[PDB]
């Protein structure tokens, strides 16, 4: 994609699109940058992730609105409205699945296999877990279980690497644990695993804060607060 545009120009325009809150453009620019075939820097990985998280975030919010309207229409005493609500929910659902498939395709061809450093490999595997989790949110057929296991497997490999190779306060390690705990609670029907993971992650980060500079302390404590916010909701 965007084959005639320079890699550096794609990156520059992705940053401009973020400033303009044009996240579909931002995602298309970063997709083009990935397809240039070179590995991504730390900043470039963040741009890719921010772009697609915004795009699929809007799709997920729309899908939830429509799914809620659809569920109310199928209750007792509800007046038959026709196929329109289901049809439009299906349209949004198919578009969302297409975006998730696109991101998973970028990770599989060939971001993950070329990611040798812990920071890059864990980042991409966390992404892989996230986008399978988004597929799992809308899955209802013969592959919901397989999609869930694909998310779990990606998150688990990222966790294993992050525990071996990163300090407990590393923001990617913390965000990975946060999202894996959300996976356990919301997708895998394992709230106790979710709570245990969030607690252990928070406590081990707390004990490592003394090693950090003022700026790194700010980065880590921000994500620790998100873990605490979930624990407050779950307990």
């Amino acid at each position: 994609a965007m084959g005639s545009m320079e890699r550096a120009s794609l990156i520059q325009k992705a940053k401009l699109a973020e400033q303009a809150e044009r996240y579909e453009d931002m995602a298309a620019f970063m997709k083009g940058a990935v397809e240039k075939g070179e590995e991504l820097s730390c900043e470039e990985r963040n741009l890719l992730s921010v772009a697609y998280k915004n795009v699929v975030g809007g799709q997920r919010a729309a899908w939830r609105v429509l799914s809620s309207i659809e569920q109310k229409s199928n209750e007792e005493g509800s007046e038959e409205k026709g196929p329109e609500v289901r049809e439009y929910r299906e349209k949004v659902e198919t578009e969302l699945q297409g975006v998730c498939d696109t991101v998973l395709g970028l990770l599989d061809s060939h971001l993950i296999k070329e990611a040798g450093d812990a920071e890059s490999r864990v980042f991409y595997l966390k992404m892989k877990g996230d986008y399978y989790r988004y597929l799992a949110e809308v899955a209802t057929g013969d592959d919901k279980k397989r999609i869930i296991d694909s998310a779990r497997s990606a998150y688990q490999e990222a966790m294993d690497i992050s525990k071996k190779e990163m300090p407990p306060t590393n923001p990617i390690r913390l965000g990975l644990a946060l999202n894996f705990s959300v996976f356990h609670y919301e997708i895998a029907n394992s709230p106790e695993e979710a709570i245990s993971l969030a607690k252990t992650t928070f406590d081990e980060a707390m004990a490592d804060l003394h090693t950090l500079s003022e700026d790194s302390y700010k980065d880590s404590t921000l994500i620790m607060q998100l873990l605490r916010d979930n624990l407050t909701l779950w307990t």
Partner: peptide, 9 residues
């Protein structure tokens, strides 16, 4: 339950 917002670089 909140995941990483992750929508601002």
């Amino acid at each position: 339950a909140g995941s990483i917002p992750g929508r601002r670089s």
